[PDB]
């Protein structure tokens, strides 16, 4: 029970989901035809979390693909593990947004979203006891960045009690592939901060840095980045699907991670990661895993964790390990770095243990942290946005579809208020 439904939009979210479902299917031992050929009894115990049953005994993911162009889904259907998706669940437009937030949220979005809303409504009412929604999208693209957040607003208006988790690929100024990303990123974050219960930010440059420096293979690819972020996806809910010492679902994480309603932006990481040649030299021990976990370069974001103070953090351990060593190690980590932890909230680290390690690995750790260090991403995004807005460049495109400068001024004021209020606690002392 307490299962969640998956919906994805935009090409970035579609590519993330294509690999995420592949990883989940590999974990649960399901072939592309949707037939169970697993080995362990635990593989089938909680299959209801992500999969639905159909007549004849096959399984289908409860995922809804939603977009304005048919090309991306036409590509993903031809790939491996593409047959799992329900053909009805695919909903697509005819024109596309062309990286225009106004198009993706005002003109085409309002007309198109009715069908996908009906489908997600049916999927949600089908579930016996809903837990929440998980969504993947990128804030740098118009169609995703707009229609995803409009759907967030609509789902808030319908299920005020459920929990929603979002995986947002925010644009970083170094590796930029769009010229109008500050505008749609700001317009997205304005609505996103008000509605989303949990949002977690991923950076392509940080993924590149991890893949080059830690993994040390010559040719990083979008497939590799998607695989890494998909492992990060799975590690969050491994504990909901497998037994463990101290089980902690998404709502438990929400309770232990969010002190104030507006501070729900997260930075994540996965351990261990080593090169192919160094696989046999390393020793799998909780000290090693926590040292890799709290390492700066292991982080999924280019924001430096040592540039600020952690408000709180949590770790999900996977495997059969002793609890006492984990606890004492966490205490030692919080002691040796007391300056980088906010002092007025004692013992700001949560740990949970699950007894099932990933496929083929001895032990794994998923790290999530709420820290003040994220403010630099927002600061530089705001700088780019205000620099481009001062000259009103690229502005008529947005203003020509019912949008006006009042919305942009309000969004900029809101975002500045967010960053100011977010750093207000950085220097706070008891």
């Amino acid at each position: 029970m307490r299962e969640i439904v998956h919906i994805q939009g935009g090409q970035c979210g579609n590519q993330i989901g294509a690999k995420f479902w592949e990883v989940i299917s590999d974990e649960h031992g399901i072939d592309p035809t949707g037939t169970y050929h697993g080995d362990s009894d635990l593989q089938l115990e909680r299959i209801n979390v992500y999969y639905n049953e159909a007549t004849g005994g096959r399984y289908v993911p409860r995922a809804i693909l939603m977009d304005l162009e048919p090309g991306t889904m036409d590509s993903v259907r031809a790939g491996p593990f593409g047959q799992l998706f329900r053909p009805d669940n695919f909903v697509f437009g005819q024109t596309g947004a062309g990286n225009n937030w106004a198009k993706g949220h005002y003109t085409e979005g309002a007309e198109l979203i009715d069908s996908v809303l009906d489908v997600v409504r049916k999927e949600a009412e089908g579930c016996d006891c809903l837990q929440g929604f998980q969504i993947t999208h990128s804030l740098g693209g118009g169609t995703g960045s707009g229609m995803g957040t409009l759907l967030i607003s609509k789902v808030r208006e319908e299920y005020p009690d459920r929990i929603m988790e979002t995986f947002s690929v925010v644009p970083s100024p170094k590796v930029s592939d769009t010229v109008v990303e500050p505008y749609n990123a700001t317009l997205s974050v304005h609505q996103l901060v008000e509605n989303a219960d949990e949002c977690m930010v991923i950076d392509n440059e940080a993924l590149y840095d991890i893949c080059f420096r830690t993994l040390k293979l010559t040719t990083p690819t979008y497939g590799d980045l998607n695989h890494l972020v998909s492992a990060a996806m799975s590690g969050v809910t491994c504990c909901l699907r497998f037994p463990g010492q101290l089980n902690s679902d998404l709502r438990k994480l929400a309770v232990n991670l969010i002190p104030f309603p507006r501070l729900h932006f997260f930075m994540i990481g996965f351990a261990p990661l080593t090169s192919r040649g160094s696989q046999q030299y390393r020793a799998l021990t909780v000290p090693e895993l926590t040292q890799q976990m709290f390492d700066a370069k292991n982080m999924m974001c280019a924001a430096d964790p040592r540039h600020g103070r952690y408000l709180t953090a949590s770790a999900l351990f996977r495997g059969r390990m002793s609890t006492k060593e984990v606890d004492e190690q966490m205490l030692n980590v919080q002691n040796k770095n007391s300056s980088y932890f906010v002092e007025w909230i004692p013992n700001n680290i949560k740990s949970s243990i699950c007894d099932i390690p990933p496929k083929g690995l001895k032990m794994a750790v998923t790290f999530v942290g709420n820290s003040t260090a994220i403010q630099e991403m927002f600061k530089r995004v705001a700088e780019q946005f205000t620099a481009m807005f001062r000259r009103k460049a690229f502005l008529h495109w947005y203003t020509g579809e019912g949008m006006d400068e009042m919305e942009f001024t309000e969004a900029e004021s809101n975002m500045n208020d967010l960053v100011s209020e977010y750093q207000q606690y950085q220097d706070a002392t008891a």
């Binding site: 037994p243 089980n247 013992n347 680290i349």
Partner: protein, 432 residues
């Protein structure tokens, strides 16, 4: 003729109940399927179904299903009653308001129905034992609600709660001071006896004696179960000086407010190197009062003792017990309050403890389990109050409790009650 009803709620409650329940069945010779291979002490913990197997007199509750699920899929599936295992749909998620006013009221009715259909069978009901981890949402809320309801449903029946408090520095969650203080407020006026069972002290014990560098929850629960069995053996085994559960609210509670106490056990020792020594009564009872052997992080040297109740099991002899008590009284590092000239209650049972196969412990003739109430316990209340105040200064995490039916001021009266309680300990501790 004498029976006791056991309640388990929360993750910690279920895990410790599992451990208690293999120990009891191995002690009484009952196979996991419930049948007896080849007098009637088991009546305290079991009740014959009429022909063949025996059903334990326990109930399990949880809102999150997976622990009850693994119990129902484990080897002890045939033992427990399928609809005695009450399972919800969604976990309270560390939120005391969720477990007390949002979802717990929809399951409390079923639990009380089960309590009725268990108590109706019993004829000589002795009392209630309840297990729940305090620093958890569902455990805290459901324990509060159940104790409150049972108090009005039964009245004067004795109730004992085995509460596991957060450790001074090691803890799992980040908001557990909140629900712990709230549960203290709830159970303070509803529980007759409350036992402190924090985890870090048992960690230290298993490190120092068994030399376990990396224990898991199983060992901790095994020691807790051994303590429970040692306490309970007096009702199911004949001994020279028997003690009943009802003779705890009449030996250990100087004033109705003060009913929190901490436990100790001896000897907890390995299976090769205890084996050069006699384990004499004097040395085992000295290990019993050894301050580092307390199961709670509280320094008994920092305060006076009020009362000490010790149960021996084995071939111990009252003369040796008396000689040991004389030595303990003469020793200067342990001092008693003036208005309690004698404060030792001692029970003797000839039934030595049993050993679980594959366990850490070994088997010896003699064992002692000690329950002490002392003035020094207020330190944990003070530290929890301080930790609460630190985060309550800026109203952190308060909005999520407010949004689930809590009134804003509900933390205030809990704060005042804790301050009054520690003041009462201070007042009791002074000299005339």
């Amino acid at each position: 003729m004498r029976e006791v009803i056991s309640i388990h709620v929360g993750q910690g409650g279920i895990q410790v109940g599992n451990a208690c329940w293999e120990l009891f069945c191995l002690e009484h010779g009952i196979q996991p399927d419930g049948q007896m291979p080849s007098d009637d002490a088991f009546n305290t913990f079991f009740s014959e179904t009429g022909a063949g197997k025996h059903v334990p007199r326990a109930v399990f509750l949880d809102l999150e299903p997976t622990v009850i699920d693994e119990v129902r899929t484990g080897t002890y599936r045939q033992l427990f009653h399928p609809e005695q295992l009450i399972s919800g749909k969604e976990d309270a998620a560390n939120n005391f308001a969720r477990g007390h006013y949002t979802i717990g009221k929809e399951i409390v009715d079923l639990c009380l129905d089960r309590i009725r259909k268990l108590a109706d069978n019993c004829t000589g009901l002795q009392g209630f034992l309840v297990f729940n981890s305090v620093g958890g949402g569902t455990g805290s809320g459901l324990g509060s609600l159940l104790l409150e309801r049972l108090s009005v449903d039964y009245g004067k029946k004795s109730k004992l709660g085995f509460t596991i408090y957060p450790s001074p520095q090691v803890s799992t969650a980040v908001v557990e001071p909140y629900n712990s203080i709230l549960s203290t407020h709830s159970l303070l006026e509803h529980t007759d006896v409350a036992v402190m069972l924090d985890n870090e002290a048992i960690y230290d014990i298993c490190r120092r004696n068994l030399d376990i560098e990396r224990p898991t929850y199983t060992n901790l629960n095994r020691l807790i179960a051994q303590v429970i069995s040692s306490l309970t053996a007096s009702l199911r085994f004949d001994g020279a000086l028997n003690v009943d559960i009802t003779e705890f609210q009449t030996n250990l509670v100087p004033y109705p407010r003060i009913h929190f106490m901490l436990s100790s056990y001896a000897p907890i020792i390995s299976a090769e190197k205890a084996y050069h020594e006699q384990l004499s009564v004097a040395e085992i009872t000295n290990s019993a009062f050894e301050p580092a052997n307390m199961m709670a992080k509280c320094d008994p040297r920092h305060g006076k003792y009020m009362a000490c109740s010790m149960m021996y099991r084995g071939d111990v002899v009252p003369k040796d017990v008396n000689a040991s008590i004389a030595t303990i009284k003469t020793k200067r590092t342990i001092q008693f309050v003036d208005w309690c000239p004698t404060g030792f209650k001692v029970g003797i049972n000839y039934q030595p403890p049993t050993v679980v196969p594959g366990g850490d412990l070994a088997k010896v003739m003699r064992a002692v389990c000690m329950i002490s109430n002392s003035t020094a316990i207020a330190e944990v209340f003070s530290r929890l109050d301080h930790k609460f105040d630190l985060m309550y200064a800026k109203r952190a995490f308060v909005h999520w409790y407010v949004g689930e039916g809590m009134e804003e001021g509900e933390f205030s009266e809990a704060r005042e009650d804790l301050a009054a309680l520690e003041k009462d300990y201070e007042e009791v501790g002074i000299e005339t």
